[PDB]
């Protein structure tokens, strides 16, 4: 993968109560990634930027909610989410 793609796969961390508990209980962090990022690319970008060692990545696609307005039906974008598991002891700074 070229040197451009490293900075373009990760779209930032995902903030929720479930991600907060995962990061503490079992060292598993949740990220927002590009809709075409593969597990191999996500694993390499985290290793290259955050200077941690990644063992497994599980990924899922999320549908965009549809909100009904006075002008008809409108929907938000579809995004992609990844759960990244690290070594038993090490954290991921920001």
């Amino acid at each position: 993968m070229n040197q451009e793609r490293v900075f373009k796969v990760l779209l930032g961390p995902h903030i929720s109560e479930k991600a907060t508990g995962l990061a503490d209980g079992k060292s598993q962090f949740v990220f927002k990634v590009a809709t075409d990022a593969t597990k191999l690319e996500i694993k390499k970008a985290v290793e290259s930027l955050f200077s941690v060692k990644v063992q497994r990545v599980t990924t899922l696609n999320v549908k965009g909610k549809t909100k009904r307005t006075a002008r008809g039906l409108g929907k938000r974008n579809d995004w992609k989410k990844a759960y990244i598991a690290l070594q038993p002891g090490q954290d991921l700074d920001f």
Partner: protein, 61 residues
């Protein structure tokens, strides 16, 4: 950063101007996600600075 001084550099010097800018944009995306970004204008400013470099880097060929 203007396009006048971008044409004072070589193709060798123009390819870490882009790498530095791309890393700079990445740090801004991370701040925007966590809500600790007050300099809202920096997001679009770096977007046009990347596109400016890619144009000059193409006028050479």
């Amino acid at each position: 950063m203007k396009a006048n001084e971008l044409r004072e550099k070589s193709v060798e010097q123009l390819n870490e101007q882009l790498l530095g800018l791309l890393r700079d944009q990445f740090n801004l995306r991370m701040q925007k996600a966590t809500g600790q970004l007050g300099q809202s204008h920096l997001l679009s400013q770096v977007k046009r600075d990347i596109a400016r470099v890619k144009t000059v880097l193409n006028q050479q060929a």
